[PDB]
Amino acid sequence: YFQGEQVQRFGDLDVHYNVFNSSFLQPNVASAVGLVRSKAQGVINVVPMEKGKPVEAAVTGSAKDLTGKVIPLEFRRVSEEGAIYNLAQFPISQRETLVFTIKVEAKGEPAQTFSFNKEIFPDE
């Protein structure tokens, strides 16, 4: 899912990411990471890259709301149709602005961390 895709760049390391409703996940992709597709659940996809090529990485992170409540994120790796994805699910209970903090540990490389804001909208 490319709609709303963003890129954070750290020299050679280009981190592509997107936050969307888990209903937009393909059934085979969701099953592979054990996520039950639900309008009540969001998903974040993190795809790290170097020189236009995908790189193996440990992706970790969390999201925080305005009350300081931390939403833990557990990323799971899935390789579907040659493309490698790092997906984490999170519940959507209401309209909210979340601050996402993601850490990317690419193979043999020092860790990189980035943050971004995302407005979450529950779906009917």
Short mmCIF file of C-alpha atoms in Angstrom, two decimals:
data_model
loop_
_atom_site.label_atom_id
_atom_site.label_comp_id
_atom_site.label_asym_id
_atom_site.label_seq_id
_atom_site.Cartn_x
_atom_site.Cartn_y
_atom_site.Cartn_z
CA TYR A 1 0.00 0.00 0.00
CA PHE A 2 1.70 3.17 -1.42
CA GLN A 3 -1.08 5.72 -0.61
CA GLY A 4 0.43 8.11 1.96
CA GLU A 5 3.99 6.60 1.70
CA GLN A 6 6.75 8.71 3.32
CA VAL A 7 10.60 8.45 3.23
CA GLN A 8 13.11 9.30 5.97
CA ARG A 9 16.69 9.50 4.70
CA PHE A 10 19.94 8.83 6.73
CA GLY A 11 22.69 9.14 4.13
CA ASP A 12 22.76 5.68 2.48
CA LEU A 13 19.77 4.36 4.57
CA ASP A 14 16.37 5.30 3.01
CA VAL A 15 13.47 4.26 5.21
CA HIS A 16 10.12 3.99 3.42
CA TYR A 17 7.11 3.88 5.73
CA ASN A 18 3.32 4.08 5.72
CA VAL A 19 0.50 3.94 8.32
CA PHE A 20 -2.89 2.67 7.09
CA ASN A 21 -5.99 0.61 8.09
CA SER A 22 -5.26 -3.18 8.32
CA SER A 23 -8.34 -3.78 6.00
CA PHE A 24 -6.06 -2.59 3.11
CA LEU A 25 -3.65 -5.53 3.78
CA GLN A 26 -3.74 -8.42 1.28
CA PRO A 27 -5.16 -11.61 2.99
CA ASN A 28 -1.89 -13.58 2.36
CA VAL A 29 0.31 -10.77 3.80
CA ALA A 30 -1.87 -10.44 6.98
CA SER A 31 -1.91 -14.29 7.57
CA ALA A 32 1.93 -14.46 7.18
CA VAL A 33 2.44 -12.08 10.15
CA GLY A 34 -0.64 -13.37 12.11
CA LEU A 35 -2.75 -10.20 11.89
CA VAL A 36 -6.55 -10.54 11.79
CA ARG A 37 -7.72 -7.80 9.28
CA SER A 38 -10.03 -5.44 11.15
CA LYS A 39 -11.29 -1.84 10.66
CA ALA A 40 -10.50 -1.40 14.45
CA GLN A 41 -6.75 -2.11 13.76
CA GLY A 42 -4.12 -0.04 12.04
CA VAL A 43 -0.86 -1.18 10.62
CA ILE A 44 2.51 0.48 10.10
CA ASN A 45 4.84 -0.77 7.27
CA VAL A 46 8.60 0.07 7.53
CA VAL A 47 10.81 -0.78 4.52
CA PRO A 48 14.55 0.11 4.94
CA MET A 49 16.76 0.43 1.84
CA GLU A 50 20.35 1.17 0.67
CA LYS A 51 21.40 2.19 -2.91
CA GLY A 52 17.82 1.30 -4.07
CA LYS A 53 18.21 -2.30 -2.77
CA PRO A 54 16.28 -3.78 0.23
CA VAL A 55 18.32 -4.48 3.37
CA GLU A 56 17.75 -6.96 6.24
CA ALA A 57 16.86 -5.12 9.47
CA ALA A 58 15.44 -5.40 12.98
CA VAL A 59 12.63 -2.80 13.14
CA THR A 60 11.34 -1.75 16.60
CA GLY A 61 9.26 1.11 17.91
CA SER A 62 6.24 2.52 19.68
CA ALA A 63 3.56 5.16 19.32
CA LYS A 64 2.57 7.76 21.93
CA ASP A 65 -0.69 9.72 22.38
CA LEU A 66 -1.17 13.26 24.03
CA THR A 67 -1.74 11.72 27.53
CA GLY A 68 1.71 10.07 27.33
CA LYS A 69 0.17 6.59 26.88
CA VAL A 70 2.70 4.44 24.97
CA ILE A 71 1.28 1.96 22.36
CA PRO A 72 3.90 -0.84 21.90
CA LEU A 73 4.58 -2.00 18.33
CA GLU A 74 5.77 -5.48 17.47
CA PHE A 75 7.16 -5.68 13.95
CA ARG A 76 6.96 -8.87 11.94
CA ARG A 77 8.83 -9.63 8.74
CA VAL A 78 7.02 -10.80 5.60
CA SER A 79 8.42 -11.35 2.07
CA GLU A 80 5.53 -11.43 -0.47
CA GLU A 81 6.10 -11.28 -4.31
CA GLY A 82 9.87 -10.65 -3.80
CA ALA A 83 9.24 -7.49 -1.65
CA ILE A 84 10.28 -7.49 2.08
CA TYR A 85 7.92 -5.80 4.65
CA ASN A 86 8.08 -5.00 8.40
CA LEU A 87 4.57 -4.72 9.75
CA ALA A 88 3.23 -3.83 13.22
CA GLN A 89 -0.45 -3.73 14.23
CA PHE A 90 -2.00 -1.28 16.73
CA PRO A 91 -5.60 -0.73 17.96
CA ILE A 92 -7.67 2.26 16.73
CA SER A 93 -10.27 3.19 19.38
CA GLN A 94 -10.81 6.89 18.49
CA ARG A 95 -9.69 9.99 16.58
CA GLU A 96 -6.15 10.73 17.77
CA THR A 97 -2.78 12.13 16.86
CA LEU A 98 0.02 9.67 17.52
CA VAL A 99 3.77 10.29 17.65
CA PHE A 100 5.53 7.21 16.14
CA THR A 101 9.20 6.55 17.19
CA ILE A 102 10.82 3.87 15.00
CA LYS A 103 14.31 2.30 15.36
CA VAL A 104 15.93 0.61 12.36
CA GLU A 105 18.92 -1.71 12.94
CA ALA A 106 20.10 -2.65 9.46
CA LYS A 107 22.47 -5.68 9.24
CA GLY A 108 26.01 -4.72 10.37
CA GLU A 109 25.06 -1.00 10.61
CA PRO A 110 24.61 1.46 13.58
CA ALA A 111 20.99 1.93 14.62
CA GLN A 112 18.87 4.85 13.25
CA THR A 113 15.86 6.32 14.98
CA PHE A 114 13.20 8.65 13.56
CA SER A 115 9.85 10.09 14.76
CA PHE A 116 6.74 11.33 12.94
CA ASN A 117 3.16 12.47 13.68
CA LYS A 118 0.16 10.71 12.28
CA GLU A 119 -3.55 11.61 12.61
CA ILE A 120 -5.52 8.39 13.12
CA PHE A 121 -9.19 8.16 12.03
CA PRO A 122 -11.42 5.23 13.05
CA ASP A 123 -13.43 3.64 10.19
CA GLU A 124 -17.14 2.62 10.36
#
